[PDB]
Motif scaffolding. Sequence first.
Motif, PDB file in Angstrom:
ATOM      1  N   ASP A   1       0.771  -1.255   0.017  1.00  0.00           N
ATOM      2  CA  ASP A   1      -0.086   0.018  -0.038  1.00  0.00           C
ATOM      3  C   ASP A   1       0.821   1.325  -0.226  1.00  0.00           C
ATOM      4  O   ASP A   1       0.586   2.220  -0.746  1.00  0.00           O
ATOM      5  CB  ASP A   1      -1.107   0.054   1.115  1.00  0.00           C
ATOM      6  CG  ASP A   1      -0.257  -0.295   2.444  1.00  0.00           C
ATOM      7  OD1 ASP A   1       0.740  -0.660   2.672  1.00  0.00           O
ATOM      8  OD2 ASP A   1      -1.117  -0.045   3.505  1.00  0.00           O
TER       9      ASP A   1
ATOM     10  N   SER B   1      -5.468  -2.686   3.886  1.00  0.00           N
ATOM     11  CA  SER B   1      -5.928  -3.178   2.496  1.00  0.00           C
ATOM     12  C   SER B   1      -4.596  -2.400   1.760  1.00  0.00           C
ATOM     13  O   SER B   1      -3.988  -1.372   1.672  1.00  0.00           O
ATOM     14  CB  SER B   1      -7.221  -2.617   1.904  1.00  0.00           C
ATOM     15  OG  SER B   1      -7.239  -0.997   1.927  1.00  0.00           O
ATOM     16  N   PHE B   2      -4.270  -3.130   0.630  1.00  0.00           N
ATOM     17  CA  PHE B   2      -3.488  -2.822  -0.342  1.00  0.00           C
ATOM     18  C   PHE B   2      -3.921  -3.332  -1.953  1.00  0.00           C
ATOM     19  O   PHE B   2      -3.119  -2.610  -2.743  1.00  0.00           O
ATOM     20  CB  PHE B   2      -1.998  -3.405  -0.115  1.00  0.00           C
ATOM     21  CG  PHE B   2      -1.956  -5.100  -0.178  1.00  0.00           C
ATOM     22  CD1 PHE B   2      -2.122  -5.640  -1.433  1.00  0.00           C
ATOM     23  CD2 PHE B   2      -1.911  -5.711   0.787  1.00  0.00           C
ATOM     24  CE1 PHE B   2      -1.975  -7.070  -1.734  1.00  0.00           C
ATOM     25  CE2 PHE B   2      -2.081  -7.322   0.713  1.00  0.00           C
ATOM     26  CZ  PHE B   2      -2.124  -7.844  -0.253  1.00  0.00           C
TER      27      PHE B   2
ATOM     28  N   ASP C   1      -6.435  -2.085  -3.207  1.00  0.00           N
ATOM     29  CA  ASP C   1      -7.129  -0.761  -3.669  1.00  0.00           C
ATOM     30  C   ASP C   1      -5.737   0.175  -4.364  1.00  0.00           C
ATOM     31  O   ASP C   1      -6.109   0.821  -5.148  1.00  0.00           O
ATOM     32  CB  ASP C   1      -7.745   0.077  -2.530  1.00  0.00           C
ATOM     33  CG  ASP C   1      -6.721   0.017  -1.140  1.00  0.00           C
ATOM     34  OD1 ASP C   1      -6.145  -0.961  -0.896  1.00  0.00           O
ATOM     35  OD2 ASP C   1      -6.884   1.084  -0.534  1.00  0.00           O
ATOM     36  N   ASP C   2      -4.600   0.208  -3.512  1.00  0.00           N
ATOM     37  CA  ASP C   2      -3.347   0.909  -3.792  1.00  0.00           C
ATOM     38  C   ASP C   2      -2.761   0.466  -4.861  1.00  0.00           C
ATOM     39  O   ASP C   2      -2.457   1.264  -5.888  1.00  0.00           O
ATOM     40  CB  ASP C   2      -2.639   0.979  -2.585  1.00  0.00           C
ATOM     41  CG  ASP C   2      -3.287   1.492  -1.160  1.00  0.00           C
ATOM     42  OD1 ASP C   2      -3.555   2.924  -1.333  1.00  0.00           O
ATOM     43  OD2 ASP C   2      -3.482   0.770  -0.543  1.00  0.00           O
TER      44      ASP C   2
ATOM     45  N   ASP D   1      -6.033   4.988   4.156  1.00  0.00           N
ATOM     46  CA  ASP D   1      -6.038   3.542   4.266  1.00  0.00           C
ATOM     47  C   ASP D   1      -6.972   2.999   2.978  1.00  0.00           C
ATOM     48  O   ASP D   1      -6.982   1.371   2.631  1.00  0.00           O
ATOM     49  CB  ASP D   1      -6.521   3.164   5.640  1.00  0.00           C
ATOM     50  CG  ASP D   1      -6.539   1.674   5.695  1.00  0.00           C
ATOM     51  OD1 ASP D   1      -5.587   0.812   5.380  1.00  0.00           O
ATOM     52  OD2 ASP D   1      -7.503   1.022   6.274  1.00  0.00           O
ATOM     53  N   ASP D   2      -7.889   3.639   2.393  1.00  0.00           N
ATOM     54  CA  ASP D   2      -8.797   3.229   1.535  1.00  0.00           C
ATOM     55  C   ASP D   2      -8.989   4.037   0.227  1.00  0.00           C
ATOM     56  O   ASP D   2      -9.351   5.223   0.245  1.00  0.00           O
ATOM     57  CB  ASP D   2     -10.289   3.009   2.208  1.00  0.00           C
ATOM     58  CG  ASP D   2     -11.499   2.725   1.514  1.00  0.00           C
ATOM     59  OD1 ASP D   2     -11.100   2.110   0.283  1.00  0.00           O
ATOM     60  OD2 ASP D   2     -12.650   3.026   1.583  1.00  0.00           O
TER      61      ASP D   2
HETATM   62 CA   LIG Z   1      -5.320   0.568   1.296  1.00  0.00          CA
END
Ligand SMILES: [Ca+2]
Length: 431
Positions: free
Chosen positions: A153, A208-209, A211-212, A257-258
């Motif tokens: 991320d 989460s990663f 998404d990144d 983070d999102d």
């Molecule tokens: Ca994330």
Amino acid sequence: AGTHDYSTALKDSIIFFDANKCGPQAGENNVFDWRGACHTTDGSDVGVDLTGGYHDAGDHVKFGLPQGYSAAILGWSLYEFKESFDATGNTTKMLQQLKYFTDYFLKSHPNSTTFYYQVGEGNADHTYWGAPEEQTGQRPSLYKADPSSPASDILSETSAALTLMYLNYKNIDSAYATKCLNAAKELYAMGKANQGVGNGQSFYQATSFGDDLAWAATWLYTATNDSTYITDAEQFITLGNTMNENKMQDKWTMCWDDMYVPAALRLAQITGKQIYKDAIEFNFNYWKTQVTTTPGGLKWLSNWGVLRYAAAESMVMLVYCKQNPDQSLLDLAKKQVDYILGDNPANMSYIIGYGSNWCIHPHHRAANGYTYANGDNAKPAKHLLTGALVGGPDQNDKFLDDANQYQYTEVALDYNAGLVGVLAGAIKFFG
Ligand SMILES: [Ca+2]
Ligand SMILES: OC[C@H]1O[C@@H](O[C@H]2[C@H](O)[C@@H](O)[C@H](O)O[C@@H]2CO)[C@H](O)[C@@H](O)[C@@H]1O
Ligand code: NI
Ligand SMILES: [Zn+2]
């Protein structure tokens, strides 16, 4: 108010970053005379020059995830609403804030498979209260990403920020722009090689990663036109998804983070697929009627940094409106911006140094200008933190102006990143 000075707010929102600059060049071309060189030996513990970048919030640690996210969102702002910056005479300063970010990322990438992403230890740093220029001692280069230590991320947000700089800077210094793109390509490669969220102590706990990775990949496609990046993106954005047909229904918003909504937005534009249009539409519909609205008209997502969330969601909607004119979205975005600017039950501008009746007790060490001594840190800040977006009011539109109430008075890079973007968008659509 019938009319709003979005132009001046934009100028201030960009200026805020000067207050958190770190390193020996922190005072160079800085509008705040109260800021000077600080933490000038960062990285010495590992033999790498890691000076530069920005203090995260009211503290002085440099946290990788929010640092990358902020640079990416600022880069996105300039990319989508360039004319807003040009016409208001803010492009030069903006580009300077962005480069201060990218220079730091490049220095933190000594070789193709290494990236240092945290300078300082949060717990110990927070036991200190004073000017960053006077906080002596060697800071630890606490976290680093390499083949055996994942940080997908963090690496991806930093990658996105570097690609966006290539896109925003290639007509000024093409050589530097390519140095950014080369680094962006490598950081992305590292992120998809060893998948896992990076470390951020208890302060920035990531969840989460995928998404990144998707987000970073869409920018690399825009810059290179290599569709293999989109093939990656479509697979990564669905990692860990346990929903039916991989349906994406984000009940949150764009934040450090999102990044599922921004990633979905770009994929919708690039692939035209319904799955992504559905994701974007769900999030927009959710905010329209499912997110709590205070009596004063503010969309209240959660208790900490509530305005940061309202501004971030509004910026996404404005980018979306460029190709998809949606009056319901323009109205919601404008109401959130105007609320921040002063249209609220507290009759106060939530942007320090702008409008009137702003926060006088910001949770910011440099601006406060005092020490823990006789609890002097409780006195009104000695300096004006021009452009800082504060946490905000409670769900009753009430604001508690106290440095101890971090929930209400702290400021941060991630907070202002979305603000600059939404303000640039307000200028384009509302003049
Ligand atoms: Ca994330
Ligand atoms: O982590 C929340 C907040 O903490 C701030 O430091 C506090 C510390 O948590 C508390 O134990 C001590 O008594 O007071 C200090 C100063 O208020 C820190 O400055 C913030 O950056 C951070 O968001
Ligand atoms: Ni108004
Ligand atoms: Zn510093």
